[model samples]
Target: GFKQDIATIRGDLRTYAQDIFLAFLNKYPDERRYFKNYVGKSDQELKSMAKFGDHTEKVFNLMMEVADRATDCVPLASDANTLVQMKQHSSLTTGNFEKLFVALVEYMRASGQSFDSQSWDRFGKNLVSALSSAGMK
Candidate 1:
């Protein structure tokens, strides 16, 4: 007999934030123009808006939820010996796996301000391509 438990992956959230911040700046070079229009009483005020504003908070919350869900997947069985053998034979034969991926992509699209099927398809293709290439590497 055996017990199943979800494993937690730990990391520095600030490192993720910094990476995202750099990527955003790389994508939007004209950010300063938009940022400059917002008048504030102090440097701290402007910095606050520049950093963890509403958009940042929304992304952070969404990422945290995604990470939590990913870490909480449970194996179907809890027998130690059988689980090891089953792993060697088990295959993902259910449409549920594909449906879950599609639903997640759809949810992300709907949560954002705009919805474009073409854009979504492109994003999905890129993601699949990246993963496929990673498998080769």
Candidate 2:
């Protein structure tokens, strides 16, 4: 199982900061309004914003939770993913979900951490499926 591969670095994953968000903007500029408050902020200033940090961690937490439970947590993961996409909440589009995974790929590689490629692939596809199946695509 890839649990070990992910569990070992889970703590480090929590340490991710402003850089990921900056990268997210560059890759998905249209997602800009999602985090409108930080549009012109610097990395250092970004760190001190408690709201930003908490939100970042929550996103990672959701990703880690879904990735680990993609197999066994169906009933649970499926439900929330559905709720998250229930009304197409504008900023929380499927693309945001995609971009988060993309950022994780970027962050993990930059950290020189080993990742379970097979599992990561499943995590992404399975998650997309879970949300759709659980509620709406």
Candidate 3:
């Protein structure tokens, strides 16, 4: 039988990641300008166009796909498939991505849902490792 652990978190996953993104921008005012086009200064505004939603969902789902691998580290297959498309996004720097990870972890804790904390920690590390290997910075 297939078990879906993520559903326990609820229908708010997509929105939640965005919250983390916004939280990061708010915490660092200067960073707002950098992300302003993607996620506007105000919560009401983000990704002003249709493609924004598609892109956001795509990015968030990528993390889920990586975690679903159930391996100790993100597999090379997953990283390889992702990196090709990932490199196209110029705004995705190592530093900003790290901040996103922190915000994601914080949001997950605040959600009051039980999760495999160790795996989540590993996911973050593997993601950064993959990003580094591809020279994402």
Candidate 4:
């Protein structure tokens, strides 16, 4: 059986991922450049991006999987069974989840550091704007 703490951790990870993605979108309003185009980029171009070579494919795959898993959670009508099933398969925690996310972004940044306070501030603002437009808190 899954522990309650695990569920809490899973929820926190999910929120963290969502926040990170939103932050990226906010910083790069073009959307096409940040997400759609990047996702559509040629394999060669993608491979040139440092961590992208090692993490992009897995990260993209995991993102899609999580989207599918969370579909029911949208509309604010997910039932206990759906939530339980999600928690069972999710392998994210607040600490490591955000760490990996920041690492990926850091890898993409020009500096190649794990944390960039300035960039992150811009990201957070953009994320808030995007999420607000999308009807999310």
Report residue 8 deviation for candidate 3 (angstroms).
4.2
Candidate number achieving the greatest TM-score relative to the actual structure = 2
Per-residue CA lDDT of model 4 for 13-84, tens digit only, reads 443343344444444445434245456555456446655533444444454343333322231223222322
Rank order (by TM-score, best first): 2, 3, 1, 4
Ranking by lDDT: 2, 3, 4, 1
Q: What is candidate 2's lDDT per residue for 1-137, written digit by digit as tens?
A: 46875575466664553466667766777776767787887767777888877877776665566556655323256545544664435335455666765765666566666766556555665565555565544
Candidate 3: segments with Cα more than 4 A from true spot: 1-5, 8-12, 36-40, 47-52, 73-81, 84-87
**Ten-residue region with minimum lDDT total, candidate 2:** 72-81
Better of 1 and 4 by TM-score: 1
TM-score of 2: 0.72
TM match of model 1 to true structure:
0.26
TM-score of each: 0.26, 0.72, 0.68, 0.25
On lDDT, the candidate that comes out on top is 2
Residue 3 displacement (Å), model 1: 20
Off by over 4 Å in 2: 17-21, 72-91
Model 3, TM vs. native: 0.68
Q: Candidate 1's residue-wise lDDT over 17-50, tens digit each?
A: 4334334433444433333443333434533554
lDDT of 1 at 93: 25
